[PDB]
Design a protein around this ligand. Structure first.
Ligand SMILES: Nc1ncnc2c1ncn2[C@@H]1O[C@H](COP(=O)(O)OP(=O)(O)O)[C@@H](O)[C@H]1O
Ligand SMILES: Nc1ncnc2c1ncn2[C@@H]1O[C@H](COP(=O)(O)OP(=O)(O)O)[C@@H](O)[C@H]1O
Ligand SMILES: Nc1ncnc2c1ncn2[C@@H]1O[C@H](COP(=O)(O)OP(=O)(O)O)[C@@H](O)[C@H]1O
Ligand code: ALF
Ligand code: ALF
Ligand code: ALF
Ligand SMILES: [Mg+2]
Ligand SMILES: [Mg+2]
Ligand SMILES: [Mg+2]
Ligand SMILES: [Zn+2]
Ligand SMILES: [Zn+2]
Ligand SMILES: [Zn+2]
Ligand SMILES: [Zn+2]
Lengths: 32, 334, 343, 364, 367, 360
């Protein structure tokens, strides 16, 4: 796995990724 | 209640303050088990309750000395858990507090001794605070504990701390060899297993705990190659489970240190077992097993009414599962 | 001492009347019927005076002793009834009963009610003193296997016709509660004078009032009946049983199963059963359990049981019943995706 | 004044009782055939008609015409029993009188013959509150009862009584009144009272009653007060929304369908009243666990959740198991992290947002 | 002199703030004449259960008649205001929880009222009664005498038996919103002739949650601190709340991934001596508010209007994943704060950790 | 007979207290303006002066001269309150009077008028230990007390009190005392007691106090007892087990280099010398924080540390910040779990062994 992901796992920080982006109602502008 | 030689200096300090009147009304002694803190507290109590002190020692013939010898001194109070119980309740603390208000029968000092402050419940610890902060005149409190950090912060802040340092390793080894006959390696291993505190090693040797340790070592030696860790249940399921779990954790730590490369190991009398453990297990699995063993020992010592057999069986099955390839290992976290 | 069942009590009473009668069991209906029969026979013999007392720590034994010692001007032939505690007699109760048995008279008829006595309770001075002049009637509730025959016989003696479906419904709804079942039969007879009890008729006037014990739940888990296990667990929760008792009862059998599964790799099952002192009747069900659960299982179950115990003990949580339901489904062959096992 | 609906509409005849046929028919047959037991016990939920049926039976026993299941209602005995002034009917509130000394005097009256009735009826209600000595005295009285006395017992906790007491009385268990019968009774009462109403309001009130007629009547009185002498759908819906306290299931349903606006509205409604956020999270976790168990086996859901059975069944049938597991894990993490959140409400909102839109990344 | 909470207890139905549905229902019931005999009031602390109960008692026992608008001037109204009315029996259930007291009370319910037309029992904290006490009230509560009324108030309704609940009409009071609390505070301060500022009142209203008693207590504390005045600076000092501008600037600096600005802000805060745990809490709150705004445009409240536009900018630029990462990092930092060598050291280390794992511009990798 | 410094130096006037300026100003303004509440609650950490301020307020309320924020300290009421034998000041120890019966008995006597003073003050200490029934019984009377009674509450865990109780009283939060304030107070006390001292000893004692003045006084008393009646830098350092030499720097360097043998040898030497493990962990955490700080900006390095600059800069340049964060997290975890390990040395060894694994 990626080094940064392993380090975050060791630090105990969980990473969240979008699953249903249609739920959000606004100009998120995630894509650039 | 043996009087060990290394208690000579510390006593000569503490009593000196009581001779000058510069004595704190709440003294907390930090010492490992088997260090003889109880003997020191008893000597201080005998000195305080003597009606005709001479030098730094009680006369031994006054009425106070006779009552202390008989063990029926009205002004001496002891707070210890009941015979069948394991914790000290709040009712005893309240009764002692209410009894302390009235004057002493013999018109002298009043001494209260808490056998172990770590066994106090939260309610008892909170109830003791007001009495401990502003005790009545000519009242002295003595408390003993292993880890002051486990005590309540408010209770801790009201006491004067005194720490007993274990003697040097060579002196302890010589004293143990004088007391009991055994090989040098066995004495050194027993001393190191007890965090360097003499008397605890003597307690291990005088009893049958050494045979139990040998049985556990043989069982682990059989289990490590085959991989059947369940068989250790019979060697661990006992009323003294925490000590055997500590021994197993020490063996695992020694194996891990040997893998990393070190000159000192706690278990110096069993090189073969630690060598086999290092050879047959990887560092990550050793760390995971050590963490699990420590956590289970803490749970057994802390939780009240927990079932020993179920916890040990679950631990052994979990270790066996961890030994399988491709299994995610635990990671420490807050 | 004679040993009898409720059906033979009337025959024994017709044969003759003894000095003391012991009624031990867990079925209120049978105990009440035996007591009523004995008291009716005694009244026929000329016992028109009856006294009842409850055995407990706060008991006035002086009144009982005075009753035994004192005579009667005209109302002789006294009858005394004792109700033992649920736990059972203790040393103080043992010596009190010994003293009472010492002061026994031909005109005093003694009856005792209570739960079944153990070997320690059986081996008592008072119990042995009555051995030569006592008859013990055993009143145990029949199991589900023998229940339908009992229901059919009881309906027959009341001049009623029960269909098979009606009998099954009655057994299911009133399992372990014979008093409720008898009252239900009486109410059905009242409702329908013709006595024709069909399935739709009985289904209207029946409610769920079953009674169970943790051993029934463990047996259901061993057999693998999810519906029965869930129903028993719900009934136990409604009653108000202590979860710790269920946890221990399940733990014993689960650890036994784990050990047997581990050591059965290179050993026949019969030898293991003999070595572990498994009762002959149970050896059947245990066998099929070992043919339904793998080594991968019986470890997740142990982990879940340990987690539930820790939550109950240190966390004082209230979700113990949900974890019990999850474990019950796990023991039966179900997916149990393990997100709820925390594995 | 207008009196209270619950008090005004006491069933004064066997025909006025709603449902409970399996009990009324048996009692009528027993009275007609003369098969009368010594002791009767009535059990059931609150507001199902135990006391009403007991009073009707007592009236029927001591009617001037005779022992009949259809009391005339016009003779002096019937009027006195209805007004509560009948000498031979002794009603005992066991809850108020529990000590043995109080019960002894009442039970010692069985040694006197009836004054103006065939039977001397004792109606003991809330009998489960008696003490052990009172139970012993009652058992001793019941062992040898005079032929001219009857005992009627009513309680909601029959398991509290000793088995000895239970084995000497015939027990009747009353059932819930069901939605349709409650609605019909409410419609009849409102028509008799000349109160305007609509079918939807009656259906909502009956559904909210939950098997109790007294609850239905109390809700009807409250709705009439809120509606200013009229029962309307909007007024009843608003009143029920005010008393609504099932935000957990609504939040679960809104979250499962990815409707953020509904989730925010439900959070605001929950915050309007005083609620514990951790309790709400625990309730949501329990609901998710129950849904998962129901998916594993249909028998998991019992009779304890009869009120919300349909919604739980629909959720179990529709939602895939994987989504349920994901939501359960997300809520577990949220509960774990709640103490360190800036605020309890903020923590709950963040966890609900994560469940709605985000998915955690697991190691390896 | 007199405490504001005790001085400003409502004495007429017009003085009650909010609770429109309950007041409307009570007024309709009184006007129509359909009066029950058992009322239960539920809600959170300091919402006006006791006040509404006393107003209902005044309406029932007023000399003019049974009306929804008590005069407030006759002898009965004044005595009820002073708590010296004979026919209003107020029971403190929290103190008298024993069944003996309940039996003594029930033994004297059939006697007629001394002067009023009704005898009103107001039982407070009824959730503390024992099980026997609860079961002893069932029959009397179900069928009381004609001239007896029961009023019950509690904050924990679910502890009552269902049998008790089925016998009474239930009214659930709802927590008050910020606008109503602020308006009430403005009115009270204007009547008291005390200077005030809008921002101080807004802060007090937001800090009081939905309880008016808490708002009045905070107002008294602020008046004491401000020496006869309610000023925004005094209230801010009392509540220990830092300016939102500084927290937003710190968040923006963290997002931009410029360590120098973050260190300068930390030094500036240390010069004043800003509480560090409060700083972390404020940053977490700002991040949560940004996430909520991303979820729904209307999530943002009015109190943040002064910075609203700025917030929106972040909602238009920062991906949700970055917001979640920052929130989680700050939450972990707060979790580990107590065990750090120093609070300042812990906060600095947390910010350095956040900068190191910046999604876009991490700190330079060593050669 | 002999009284410790903590008991002897209890403040007896509003001007004798250290810090807590906001609370004192609020109380003085309230007393001067005549706006006196009937329910005061004091919250804060341990040994910050909650009981002292409560007693001062009680003394000010019942002073013979009048309701003033500056009690005379010479009238009969002030002297009796100072001696703790004033009839109208009833002090309750809630830690031993948790029973609801005691609370009911206390409340039954509120109708009686005060004996001598103009107010009857109740000072409930450790109020967080009362049972739920006690709080519920209090609620009603606490809401509307008679005109001649006051309630003063002091607690260290306000979270445990129900919200209903908190809503009825004015709350005052006491901040933890700063290091400078504690040092100044200790210096003043020692000067008044005529005891020799050194600035560094006072600095170390204040740092070890951790915001509690009672703890500072206890440590000072221990140092005086163990230092032949004199406070000296060496005595305090020995008592607290100060690291002094750069053992922590060498240990962290060995850990970073992933040389297990060196780390174990250093740990064995430290154990033989008998140092405090908590101090070692704290020093290592401080060094890691400083190294992380230097990476962001070279000028961040302190001038007082101008003896190991080369090694610190080498570590900062050679180690990425992520590894520094990992090591900091590992040391924090080790510090958290240290008291729960079988031995302190065993816990330290476990932490170091876990940290040694973070190297490719
Ligand atoms: N089966 C029923 N038919 C008609 N009304 C009923 C019925 N059950 C309850 N009620 C109504 O509910 C009110 C209270 O019932 P109650 O006698 O208290 O029953 P319980 O004793 O089970 O609580 C009565 O005034 C009655 O009008
Ligand atoms: N709706 C309201 N309108 C006006 N004042 C209120 C209201 N609710 C609470 N208060 C204020 O709060 C104080 C305490 O209210 P209280 O009677 O204790 O309510 P509860 O019984 O719900 O705690 C009162 O003195 C009153 O000034
Ligand atoms: N603000 C302060 N000013 C001066 N001394 C203080 C202060 N706070 C605490 N102390 C000292 O600490 C000792 C104990 O304080 P105490 O009244 O117990 O506070 P708390 O009630 O918060 O524990 C006192 O004898 C006093 O000498
Ligand atoms: F009177 Al009921 F259930 F409330 F019988
Ligand atoms: F008096 Al309250 F909630 F505090 F009703
Ligand atoms: F910490 Al304290 F009284 F000793 F509040
Ligand atoms: Mg009833
Ligand atoms: Mg109130
Ligand atoms: Mg204090
Ligand atoms: Zn002597
Ligand atoms: Zn008639
Ligand atoms: Zn008026
Ligand atoms: Zn003075």
């Amino acid at each position: 796995t990626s080094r940064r992901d392993w380090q975050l796992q060791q630090l105990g920080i969980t990473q969240w990724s979008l699953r249903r982006p249609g739920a959000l109602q606004g100009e998120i502008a995630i894509a650039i | 209640m043996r009087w060990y030689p290394w208690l000579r200096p510390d006593f000569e300090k503490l009593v000196a303050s009581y001779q000058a009147g510069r004595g704190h009304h709440a003294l907390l002694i930090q010492a490992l088990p088997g260090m003889g803190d109880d003997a020191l507290i008893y000597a201080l109590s005998r000195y305080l309750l003597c009606q005709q002190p001479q030098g730094h020692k009680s006369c031994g013939h006054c009425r106070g000395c006779q009552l202390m010898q008989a063990g029926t001194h009205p002004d001496y109070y002891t707070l210890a858990p009941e015979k069948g119980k394991n914790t000290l309740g709040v009712d005893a603390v309240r009764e002692v507090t209410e009894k302390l208000n009235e004057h002493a029968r013999l018109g002298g000092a009043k001494v209260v001794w808490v056998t172990d402050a770590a066994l106090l419940t939260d309610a008892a610890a909170n109830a003791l605070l007001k009495t401990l902060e502003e005790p009545p005149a000519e009242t002295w409190f003595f408390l003993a504990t292993r880890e002051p950090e486990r005590l309540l912060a408010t209770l801790r802040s009201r006491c004067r701390l005194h720490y007993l340092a274990p003697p040097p390793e060579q002196y302890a080894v010589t004293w143990l060899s004088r007391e009991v006959t055994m090989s040098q390696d066995a004495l050194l291993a027993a001393l190191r297993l007890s965090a360097g505190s003499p008397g605890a090693a003597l307690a291990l040797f005088q009893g049958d705990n050494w045979q139990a340790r040998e049985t556990l070592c043989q069982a682990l030696a059989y289990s490590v190659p085959s991989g059947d860790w369940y068989s250790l249940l019979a060697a661990l399921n006992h009323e003294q489970a925490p000590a055997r779990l500590h021994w197993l954790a020490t063996l695992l730590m020694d194996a891990l240190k040997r893998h990393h490369g070190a000159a000192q190991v706690t278990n110096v009398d069993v090189p073969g077992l630690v060598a086999e453990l290092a050879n047959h297990l990887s560092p990550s699995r050793l760390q995971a097993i050590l963490g699990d063993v420590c956590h289970i020992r803490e749970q057994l010592m802390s939780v009240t009414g927990i079932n020993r057999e179920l916890l040990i069986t679950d631990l052994l099955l979990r270790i066996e599962h961890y030994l399988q390839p491709g299994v995610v290992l635990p990671v420490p976290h807050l | 001492m004679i040993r009898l069942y409720p059906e033979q009590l009337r025959a024994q009473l017709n044969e003759g009347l003894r000095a003391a009668y012991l009624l031990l069991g867990n079925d209120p209906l049978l105990l009440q019927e035996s007591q009523d029969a004995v008291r009716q026979v005694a009244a026929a013999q000329g016992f028109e005076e009856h006294h009842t007392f409850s055995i407990d720590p706060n008991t006035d034994w002086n009144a009982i002793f005075s009753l035994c010692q004192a005579m009667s001007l005209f109302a002789s032939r006294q009858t005394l009834l004792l109700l033992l505690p649920e736990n059972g007699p203790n040393a103080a109760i043992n010596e009190q009963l010994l003293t009472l048995t010492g002061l026994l008279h031909d005109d005093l008829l003694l009856i005792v009610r209570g739960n079944k006595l153990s070997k320690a309770q059986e081996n008592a001075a008072w119990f042995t003193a009555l051995a030569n002049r006592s008859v013990q009637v055993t009143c145990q509730t029949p199991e589900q296997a023998q229940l339908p025959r009992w229901v059919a016989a009881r309906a027959k003696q009341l001049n009623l016709e029960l269909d098979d479906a009606a009998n099954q419904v009655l057994c299911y709804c009133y399992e372990g509660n014979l008093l409720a079942l008898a009252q239900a039969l009486e109410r059905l007879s009242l409702l329908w004078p013709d006595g024709k009890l069909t399935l739709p008729r009985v289904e209207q006037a029946v409610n769920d009032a079953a009674h169970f014990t943790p051993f029934h739940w463990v047996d259901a888990l061993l057999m693998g009946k999810s519906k029965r296990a869930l129903h028993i667990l719900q009934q136990l929760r409604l009653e108000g049983s202590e979860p710790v008792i269920l946890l221990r009862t399940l733990q014993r059998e689960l650890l036994l199963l784990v050990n047997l599964k581990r050591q059965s790799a290179h050993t026949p099952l019969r030898a293991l059963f003999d070595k572990h002192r498994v009762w002959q009747n149970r050896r059947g069900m245990m066998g099929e359990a070992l043919n339904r659960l793998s080594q991968t299982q019986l470890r997740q179950a142990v982990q879940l049981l340990t987690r539930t115990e820790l939550t109950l003990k240190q966390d004082y949580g209230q979700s113990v019943w949900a974890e019990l339901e999850g474990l019950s489904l796990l023991l039966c062959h179900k997916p149990l995706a393990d997100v709820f096992i925390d594995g | 004044s207008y009196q209270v609906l619950a008090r005004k509409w006491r069933p004064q005849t066997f025909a006025d009782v709603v449902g409970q046929e399996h009990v009324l028919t048996a009692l009528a047959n027993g009275l007609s055939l003369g098969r009368i037991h010594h002791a009767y016990l009535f059990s059931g939920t609150r507001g199902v008609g135990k006391t009403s049926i007991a009073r009707l039976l007592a009236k029927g026993l001591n009617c001037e015409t005779g022992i009949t299941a259809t009391p005339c209602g016009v003779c002096d005995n019937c009027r006195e029993i209805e007004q509560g002034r009948f000498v031979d009917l002794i009603e005992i509130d066991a809850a108020s009188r529990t000590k043995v000394e109080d019960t002894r005097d009442l039970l010692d009256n069985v040694q006197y013959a009836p004054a103006r009735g065939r039977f001397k009826v004792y109606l003991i209600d809330e009998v489960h509150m008696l003490s052990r000595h009172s139970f012993n005295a009652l058992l001793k009285t019941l062992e040898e009862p005079p032929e001219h006395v009857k005992f009627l017992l009513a309680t909601t906790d029959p398991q509290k009584l000793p088995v000895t007491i239970l084995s000497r009385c015939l027990q009747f268990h009353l059932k819930a009144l069901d939605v349709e019968q409650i609605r019909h009774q409410l419609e009849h009462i409102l028509n008799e009272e000349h109160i305007a109403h609509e079918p939807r309001a009656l259906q909502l009130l009956a559904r909210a009653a939950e098997g109790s007629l007294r609850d239905a009547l109390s809700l009807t009185d409250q709705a009439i007060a809120s509606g200013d002498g009229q029962v309307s759908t909007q007024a009843v819906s608003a009143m029920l929304g005010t008393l609504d306290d099932d935000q957990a299931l609504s939040l679960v349903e809104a979250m499962v369908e990815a409707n953020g606006e509904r989730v925010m509205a439900l959070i605001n409604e929950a915050a309007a009243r005083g609620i514990e956020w951790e309790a709400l999270l625990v309730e949501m976790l329990g609901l998710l666990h129950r849904i998962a168990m129901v998916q594993l086996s249909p028998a998991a859901l019992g009779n304890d959740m009869a009120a919300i059975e349909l919604r739980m069944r629909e959720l179990a049938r529709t939602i895939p198991p994987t989504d349920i597991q994901l939501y359960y894990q997300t809520l577990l993490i949220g509960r774990k992290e709640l103490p360190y959140a800036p605020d309890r409400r903020m923590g709950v909102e963040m966890t609900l947002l994560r469940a709605l839109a985000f998915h955690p990344r697991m190691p390896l």
